[PDB]
């Protein structure tokens, strides 16, 4: 499952290297052997269709397609139907004596269970919701619960889908506070600061992300680089320096893996070299890290541009500031950079509602000047009672 | 398109990242040329 | 034991690391945690112990 979806969003984002697109469907090509992984890889494979995902034995065999591993053969089908009814016939009635026998129950989920896993090594996005279902309804144990969790997240980020698995881990986490004791919270808040990392968690759970590690990864739902991955990125990327300059500033967590997965090296490493207050090198290290981290990774990508330039503003913001003062050019120029350029991206961070930046082009001179209480006192105040205007229309809609 | 990203403000704009490194090296460069 | 009092008259047995590391990665799942943890060590560690 785990690195499914992701050599799938590897090569789905196949840009940079062959080996992008390559390397990741040359394990799924051999995962498509491993498990029976044609359902959705079927789909997978009109997933990155109609870019580079355009060679299949199945949907479509392009030129185009710089990806031909997006291909199939029928004899996966087969393959499949067989392991499919295989699996299927097995559990059937296996489910079917333990509903004979009457056999357990959580010992009837059981099988269940397994029934359910296949259609994450299948990729059906079905029977094992039906099946968790008729797992959950055999549930006696929040233990059991505990495998929607399980089942819904590898639904949902088989495909590295949203809300809904979201909603059910929202629901399957509402449901006891147990949070699987510590842990299905983290489970729950990791994936959670996964879902809410489509696109977001930015503020939210990235911290929460952050918050809990080492306690969990998945295996096949992710991996223990990877929650680290995310967790400084964003939390890096958005939250508190003070935090950050307290727990990324370094964690044993982050001096376990650091450059362990060399891959890092960067987010909060190259950003600590932001943190360091360079002027080039963490611009460098901006794409240094951003290529090697943002398109690599599922939301790493989607997402793009918040960080980019927010980082890039990030070095505006606090790390160089407005400035305050300071001859735009001293920075501009004296940074061995270019002074329009970087003036204008950075000069649109004048309307951008961010900046305290004062800025001159001419003089090329920077300043700035204090944000009053404005923060957001009235500002919003116009969204609710239209929001109850919606609602005071949607009352007078009430009526009859 | 899709349904629910990060949204607004607004789509920015695009072939920046590059770009600065296209400049940053070109920057660099300029500062190599410096 | 007569029948009708006791009638299937069966009989507990004891445990050891495994079952222990089980209740230990039961009572120790419901306690809030960290990873880096093999229960099993603990459990080894374990011995004359019970759930």
């Known amino acids: 499952n785990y690195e499914v979806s992701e050599k799938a969003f590897l090569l789905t984002q196949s840009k940079v290297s062959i080996e992008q697109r390559k390397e990741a469907a040359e394990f799924v090509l051999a995962k498509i052997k491993e498990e029976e992984m044609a359902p959705y890889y079927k789909y997978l494979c009109e997933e990155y269709l109609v870019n580079n995902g355009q060679s299949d034995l199945e949907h479509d065999e392009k030129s185009d397609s710089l990806n031909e591993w997006i291909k199939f053969d029928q004899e996966l089908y087969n393959e499949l139907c067989k392991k499919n009814e295989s699996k299927i016939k097995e559990l059937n009635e296996k489910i079917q004596k333990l509903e004979e026998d009457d056999e357990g129950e959580l010992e009837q989920a059981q099988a269940w269970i397994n029934l359910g896993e296949y259609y994450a090594q299948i990729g059906d996005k079905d029977n094992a919701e039906k099946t968790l279902g008729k797992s959950l309804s055999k549930a006696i144990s929040t233990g059991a619960k505990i495998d929607v969790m399980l089942t819904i997240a590898r639904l949902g980020f088989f495909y590295n889908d949203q809300l809904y698995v979201k909603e059910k881990l929202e629901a399957v986490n509402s449901m006891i506070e147990k949070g699987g004791d510590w842990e299905r919270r983290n489970r729950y808040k990791t994936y959670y600061g996964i879902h809410c990392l489509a696109v977001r968690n930015f503020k939210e759970a990235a911290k929460l992300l952050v918050d809990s590690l080492a306690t969990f990864t998945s295996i096949e739902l992710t991996s223990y680089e990877s929650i680290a991955t995310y967790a400084s990125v964003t939390g890096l990327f958005t939250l508190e320096r003070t935090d950050l300059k307290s727990k990324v500033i370094d964690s044993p967590e982050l001096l376990s893996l650091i450059s362990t997965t060399a891959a890092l090296q960067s987010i909060s490493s190259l950003t600590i070299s932001l943190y360091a207050s360079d002027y080039a090198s963490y611009f460098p290290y901006l794409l240094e890290t951003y290529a090697n981290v943002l398109i690599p990774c599922k939301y790493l990508n989607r997402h793009a541009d918040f960080f980019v330039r927010e980082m890039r503003r990030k070095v505006y913001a606090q790390l160089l500031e407005s400035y305050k003062t300071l001859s735009l050019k001293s920075m501009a120029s004296a940074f061995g950079v270019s002074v329009a350029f970087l003036d204008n991206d950075l000069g649109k961070f004048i309307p951008n509602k961010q900046l305290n930046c004062v800025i001159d082009r001419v003089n090329g001179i920077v300043e700035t000047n204090r944000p009053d209480n404005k923060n957001a006192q009235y500002h919003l105040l116009v969204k609710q009672g239209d929001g109850l205007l919606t609602k005071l229309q949607k009352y007078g809609a009430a009526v009859r | ?34 | 034991l007569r029948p009708g009092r006791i009638d299937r008259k069966i009989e507990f047995p004891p445990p050891s690391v495994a079952a222990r590391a089980e209740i230990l990665r039961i009572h120790s799942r419901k306690m809030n945690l960290t990873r880096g943890i093999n229960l099993r060590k603990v459990a080894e560690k374990m011995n004359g112990c019970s759930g």
């Open chain 2, 1 to 34: 398109q899709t349904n629910i990203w990060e949204e607004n403000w607004d789509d920015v704009e695009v072939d920046d990242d590059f770009t600065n490194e296209l400049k940053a090296e070109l920057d660099r460069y300029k500062r190599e040329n410096q």
